[PDB]
Amino acid sequence: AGRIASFLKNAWAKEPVLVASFAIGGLAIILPSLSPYTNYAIRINRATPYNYPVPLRDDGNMPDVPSHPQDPQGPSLEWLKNL
Amino acid sequence: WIARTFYDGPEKNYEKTMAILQIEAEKAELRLKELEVRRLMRARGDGPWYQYPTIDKALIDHSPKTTPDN
Ligand SMILES: CCCCCCCCCCCCCCCCC[C@@H](O)O[C@H](CO[C@H](O)CCCCCCCCCCCCCCC)COP(=O)(O)OCC[N+](C)(C)C
Ligand SMILES: CCCCCCCC/C=C\CCCCCCCC(=O)O[C@H](COC(=O)CCCCCCC/C=C/CCCCCCCC)COP(=O)(O)OCCN
């Protein structure tokens, strides 16, 4: 393990730019897989309405589809406001 | 003695020739039939052969398209 420490110390001298660039690139590759907020970003992208929500034809068997926007049914965006 | 030791009766050759003639006549009939069937399928296209590909219908998206008139 000592050779790695010597190599990193040697590279931090006389080549700091390459060390910094490789560190930043490696962190950019690794970190997104660990952040808990990437799912939040995906959800925020989901929640953005670019298109008209086409209503469904009521057949008496959709208890979970609301009849009005004010109805409690359907997805809520309270988590986004809390963010 | 020559006939007994080296050769066989006429019936063997006779019946073998009958069998050979049957086989090869069937083969000729099958060849003509194959040519006719190939011509018919290539002209019509209603058989298993000469089936050229078309666009799959499972690729089409059946969903509202931001505009009522598609
Ligand atoms: C006084 C005698 C006058 C007549 C002399 C006749 C001598 C005959 C010699 C020439 C014969 C030529 C061969 C003709 C036929 C050979 C090929 C084939 O037709 O015969 C095969 C058989 O061949 C024989 O088994 C072997 C023939 C070999 C002859 C060799 C003669 C010369 C050899 C010389 C050797 C010298 C010694 C070595 C010195 C170093 C297959 O017969 P097979 O399918 O079963 O028959 C079944 C018949 N059934 C169905 C009715 C039962
Ligand atoms: C998976 C991550 C990838 C993304 C990160 C990188 C993004 C962009 C950076 C890469 C660009 C291309 C790099 C090209 C490398 C060339 C190396 C080379 O041969 O140059 C050597 C110099 O460099 C070397 O000696 C070879 C590599 C030296 C170190 C390289 C980085 C080592 C690891 C760095 C990161 C370590 C981990 C970070 C820990 C930091 C501590 C917190 C010669 O120097 P010259 O300029 O030609 O001569 C002029 C002087 N007379």
Side-chain angles (χ1 to χ4, degrees):
Chain A
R3 186 261 181 188
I4 289 294
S6 69
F7 182 87
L8 271 295
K9 194 212 181 143
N10 188 359
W12 188 231
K14 90 181 72 175
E15 281 295 358
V17 170
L18 281 186
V19 173
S21 67
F22 272 109
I24 294 168
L27 275 173
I29 292 172
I30 286 144
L31 274 191
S33 65
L34 308 192
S35 179
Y37 293 120
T38 184
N39 289 327
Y40 284 90
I42 295 180
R43 300 239 304 282
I44 294 169
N45 267 344
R46 293 272 174 61
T48 309
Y50 291 102
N51 304 326
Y52 196 101
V54 187
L56 309 166
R57 173 187 279 284
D58 194 349
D59 53 318
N61 263 316
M62 311 186 288
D64 293 348
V65 178
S67 297
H68 198 263
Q70 297 294 141
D71 290 355
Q73 286 75 235
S76 66
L77 271 183
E78 298 323 298
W79 61 268
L80 189 48
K81 314 192 81 173
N82 274 347
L83 265 190
Chain B
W1 169 69
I2 281 183
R4 181 176 63 245
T5 292
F6 290 124
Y7 294 81
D8 309 354
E11 60 267 11
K12 175 162 161 113
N13 187 73
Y14 199 82
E15 275 138 21
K16 281 177 53 179
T17 306
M18 293 178 71
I20 288 169
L21 282 185
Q22 186 193 12
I23 292 180
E24 276 287 355
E26 304 273 40
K27 278 207 270 212
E29 301 305 19
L30 284 168
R31 290 197 189 105
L32 276 297
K33 195 193 281 323
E34 183 195 350
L35 280 179
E36 190 51 16
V37 165
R38 278 180 59 167
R39 214 210 73 242
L40 286 177
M41 289 192 198
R42 205 196 180 124
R44 274 80 172 274
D46 53 356
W49 305 340
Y50 301 100
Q51 287 299 305
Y52 297 128
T54 51
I55 318 293
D56 189 6
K57 76 186 291 182
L59 289 167
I60 310 180
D61 193 20
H62 299 292
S63 302
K65 305 287 200 329
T66 62
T67 300
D69 303 336
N70 295 315

